[PDB]
Amino acid sequence: PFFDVQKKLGVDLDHWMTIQSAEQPHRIPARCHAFEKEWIECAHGIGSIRAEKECKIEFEDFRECLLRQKTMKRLNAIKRQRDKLIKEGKYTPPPHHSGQEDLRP
Template identity: 35%
Template sequence: MSVSPWLKSPFTDLTAGLISHQWYGECADMEMKVLECFEAYGLDKGLKKCDLLIQDFRECSLRHKQMKRMVAMRNERHRQAWNGERSKEEKYAKGPAPDSY
């Protein structure tokens, strides 16, 4: 995770915001905390001192745990349908009625 680009030019200044979460992202606050931590400790020490913040930010942006949970629930539903504990028609819960939002 690098804080500044290897080659600095006006083009990198213009495109720097495209790879951040600051444009209406729900992880914007976490990203700012990580960057402030890096600013306080520097990049080398910051990788060690800010490790928990970095892990939280990665989870917020990549959602590994959420995807593993979703796959586990889907696999459990498939297992139940395969073993006959749940009917194949009712494998998933019914969706909301039309115009119920």
């Protein structure tokens, strides 16, 4: 049972720490505020059964914001091909990726 006392009495006991998209102190956004907002606004009211199949793309974007598995996989691929071309000698790093250019601002 979920006796929803908080909605029946109209009190906010623990809805505030529940999601990252809620009102934070000093309006601090979470890192995946936009993704979680998009997925929550997709899955709202349609039930969990329709949400698991009709909001898959928002949930994959949000889970990949959280864990960054695809981004780290792409960085692994680029850094590994770069290490292979450094070991073979077919590539050289530029002066702005070796630390010789005295950064912009």
